[PDB]
Design a protein that fits this description.
binds sodium ion; EC 3.1.1.3; alpha/beta; lipid degradation; eleven-stranded mixed sheet; serine esterase; signal; binds zinc ion; about 15% strand; about 30% helix; Rossmann fold; three-stranded mixed sheet; hydrolase; globular
């Protein structure tokens, strides 16, 4: 009476696990490995999964979709990978009903990842138990196709691309049809995701495929407008893979058919992204990502925001989201005894600004190095490189998306955040998922303070669209974003009234959105 038992879904009965929590009757029902789509076929759209007889034991995580290992010398996963997982919190009196539902989309540059995430201190990163039980929401995680198998495209009808985005959509659609049986409110689905998953969340809100499916969304460190999201020249990347696996490149239709019948592991390992000794910035080697296909993504994402007019929206970034990419593009910021120079930074800036030529490289270099005269230290110079990467890859796109969402809003509310701390300890996913509570030996009291606050805001927002209103108290009133106030919440280990701030790096935003765009394009 106080737990689910066998659950009736469209595909048949599903049985998970009940885990007692605390001493007084609370618990959580855990389902792992529920199929939401058929075994995949290489470079084909996802299809319904056939029903089953009897009761499916949803007891263990299922295989991720085929992807390269981090060494890039081998693969793991499987073509049969479109599975999802569900945590349902339970009180001590009766079974939960009408709960908000949060669907997580993982990141990993569209190239890697799974619904459970990295395992550390005997705990998977995306284990939904802490969010579910602390915020009284249902949490869903799931796998989607990544790499060439997720995103290879010719930019035309021969190989339209976006397979991995369709997989995400199929999991959302399944949740809408089925989650009420688990005690969820299907009218109240919130998507949330980080990095590539934040851009995915964004793209899902913009696609007409999701009309009437999504109530709210949270983009963490990535939006559809980030420069690494849309591949402008997919046929170049598809030809590269075709040459490497022995397919002819002259006819796009014959090339597409040959790629579809190539060993999926050879497609996956065809291109290795190099991380050392690179001619262009790390961005340039981001290949197998979403495309504008005229279908799932009907137009450039910037023109699609009418589709999210009634989707409440949080978007924010991490203080040093650009750090990883800065480290690759300028290794000197790692070694304490190696100098970043004006010449190194000019070069990096010029690569990012080539469509605006010499004039665009200089205006950008000059604005970012203005502070170097009075503060020429390496601490300031290296922080400038990180800020530059954070700005162009994450912060500026996120601010443009916030503005477009606010400008197209009907009933939708808009919220902005900046996360600042002190995987790296600086990353916000582990606090969103409550790892400082799930594995407390790895974390300090301040970490559990940060995590407690983020879960309160995230799950209040899921319940009501208002991060200040719900089952949890919050430390700072989070003011909805408008163009007038341009307010963002600064999330740190000590929050109070002054944590609600405004005009985040506004001179740099204005530089990129007005000054830099007002420059002539060069060829
Ligand atoms: Na757990
Ligand atoms: Zn199956
Ligand atoms: Zn696994
Ligand atoms: Zn297989
Ligand atoms: Zn009801
Ligand atoms: Zn659909
Ligand atoms: Zn490039
Ligand atoms: Zn160049
Ligand atoms: Zn992150
Ligand atoms: Zn900490
Ligand atoms: Zn207010």
């Amino acid at each position: 009476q106080s737990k689910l038992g066998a659950v009736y879904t469209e595909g048949g009965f599903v049985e998970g696990v009940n885990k007692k929590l605390g001493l007084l009757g609370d618990s959580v029902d855990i389902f792992k490995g529920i199929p939401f789509a058929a075994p995949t076929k290489a470079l084909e759209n996802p299809q319904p999964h056939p029903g089953w007889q009897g009761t499916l034991k949803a007891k263990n995580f299922k295989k991720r979709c085929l992807q390269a290992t981090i060494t890039q010398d081998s693969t793991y996963g499987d073509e049969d990978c479109l599975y999802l997982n569900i945590w349902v919190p339970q009180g001590r009196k009766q079974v939960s009903r009408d709960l908000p539902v949060m669907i997580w989309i993982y990141g990993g540059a569209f190239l890697m990842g799974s619904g459970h995430g990295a395992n550390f201190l005997n705990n998977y990163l995306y284990d939904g138990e802490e969010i579910a039980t602390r915020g009284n929401v249902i949490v869903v995680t799931f796998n989607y196709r990544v790499g060439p198998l997720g995103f290879l495209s010719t930019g035309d009808a021969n190989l339209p691309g976006n397979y991995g985005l369709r997989d995400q959509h199929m999991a959302i659609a399944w949740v809408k049809r089925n989650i009420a049986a688990f005690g969820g409110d299907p009218d109240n689905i919130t998507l949330f995701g980080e990095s590539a998953g934040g851009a995915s969340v964004s793209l899902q809100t913009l696609s007409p495929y999701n009309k009437g499916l999504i109530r709210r969304a949270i983009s963490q460190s990535g939006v559809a407008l980030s420069p690494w999201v849309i591949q402008k020249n997919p046929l170049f990347w598809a030809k590269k893979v075709a040459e490497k696996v022995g397919c002819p490149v002259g006819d796009a239709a014959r090339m597409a058919q040959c790629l579809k019948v190539t060993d999926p592991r050879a497609l996956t390992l065809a291109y290795k992204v190099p991380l050392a000794g690179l001619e262009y910035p790390m961005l340039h080697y981001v290949g197998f990502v979403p495309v504008i296909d005229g279908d799932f993504i009907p137009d450039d994402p910037i023109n699609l925001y009418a589709n999210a007019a009634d989707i409440d929206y949080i978007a924010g970034t991490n203080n040093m989201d650009g750090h990883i990419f800065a480290s690759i593009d300028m290794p000197a910021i790692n070694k304490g005894n190696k100098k970043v120079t004006e010449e190194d930074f000019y070069k990096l800036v010029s690569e990012f600004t080539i469509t605006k030529g010499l004039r665009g490289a200089k205006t950008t270099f000059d604005v970012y190095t203005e502070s170097w005269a009075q503060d020429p230290s390496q601490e300031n110079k290296k922080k400038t490189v990180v800020d530059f990467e954070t700005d162009v890859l994450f912060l500026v796109p996120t601010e443009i998306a916030l503005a477009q969402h606010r400008a197209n809003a009907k009933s939708a509310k808009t919220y902005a955040y900046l996360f600042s701390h002190p995987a790296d300890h600086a990353d916000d996913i582990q606090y969103v998922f409550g790892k400082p509570f799930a594995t407390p030996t790895g974390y300090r009291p301040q970490d559990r303070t940060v995590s407690k606050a983020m879960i309160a805001y995230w799950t209040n927002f899921a319940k009501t669209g208002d991060p200040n209103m719900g089952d949890s108290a919050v430390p700072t009133h989070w003011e909805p974003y408008t163009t007038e106030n341009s307010g963002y919440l600064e999330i740190t280990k000590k929050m109070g009234s002054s944590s609600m701030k405004r005009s985040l790096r506004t001179n740099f935003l204005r530089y990129w959105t007005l000054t830099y765009l007002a420059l002539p394009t060069v060829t």
